[PDB]
Amino acid sequence: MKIYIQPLSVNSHTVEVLANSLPKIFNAEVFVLPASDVSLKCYNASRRQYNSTCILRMLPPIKVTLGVTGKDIYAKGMNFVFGEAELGGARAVLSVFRLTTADSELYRERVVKEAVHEIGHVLGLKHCSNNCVMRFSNSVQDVDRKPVSFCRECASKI
Ligand SMILES: [Zn+2]
Ligand SMILES: [Zn+2]
């Protein structure tokens, strides 16, 4: 498995977190693509948020490609989303905007959890109700309560 991280208006240090954490989690070769600013095509001026579905479309369809942004994102019908993924496809996007917090270590932990969650969807995993990183999180309090690891059921399916 190969994972391509596409920085899209994001702190380079946060990208490094993912480059350093994801290989072991996915037993994958990880590539960091050249940084770019997230496309203004995907900016909703009324909401001052970027549409995640728009961002996904602009990523290369190379499994697995994860776009990562510091901008707040939303998808249709949602006030915000942490991310959006093609289930069993090639592409996902993560926003770290809603994860911001004072404790650097907690921020880091949230970033890894939510990246792993998105990539799990690309690998074909639906939301999981177990003690699992694939749980849906309504808020960052939910993110903090779920683990970074896949449950035994989800791990068996990758
Ligand atoms: Zn999800
Ligand atoms: Zn699970």
Residue numbers in the entry: 1 to 158
Paper text:
Archaemetzincins are metalloproteases occurring in archaea and some mammalia. They are distinct from all the other metzincins by their extended active site consensus sequence HEXXHXXGXXHCX4CXMX17CXXC featuring four conserved cysteine residues. The overall structure of AfAmzA resembles those of other metzincins, consisting of an upper N-terminal domain (NTD) and a lower helical C-terminal domain (CTD) with respect to the active site helix α2, which harbors two of the three zinc-binding histidines (H117EIGH121) and the catalytic base Glu118. On the other hand, as the homologous archaemetzincins from Methanopyrus kandleri (MkAmzA) and Methanocorpusculum labreanum (MlAmzA), AfAmzA exhibits a second zinc-binding site located in the CTD immediately below the catalytic zinc binding site and close to the eponymous, structurally important Met-turn.
Consequently, two different crystal forms are observed, one triclinic and one hexagonal. In the nat-AfAmzA::malonate complex the catalytic zinc ion is coordinated in a tetrahedral geometry by the three histidine side-chains as well as by one carboxylate oxygen atom (O7) of malonate, with ligand-metal distances of 2.0–2.1 Å. The catalytic water molecule is displaced by the malonate O7 atom and is moved towards the catalytic base Glu118. While both nat-AfAmzA structures with carboxylic acids bound in the active-site cleft superpose quite well despite different crystal lattices, the structural superimposition of nat-AfAmzA::malonate with NHis-AfAmzA shows that substantial changes take place in the bulge edge segment and the S1′-wall forming segments, effecting main-chain and side-chains of the corresponding residues. This is opening up the substrate-binding groove in order to provide space for a ligand. The side-chains of the conserved Phe80 and Phe82 residues move slightly while the side chain of Met78 adopts another conformation. In the S1′-wall forming segment the side chain of Phe136 performs a χ1 rotation of 115° and interacts with the malonate carboxylate group with its Cδ1 just 3.3 Å away from the malonate oxygen atom. The side chain of Asn138 follows this movement by occupying another rotamer while its main chain Cα moves by 2.1 Å. On the other hand, we detect upon ligand binding opening of the active site at the S' sites.
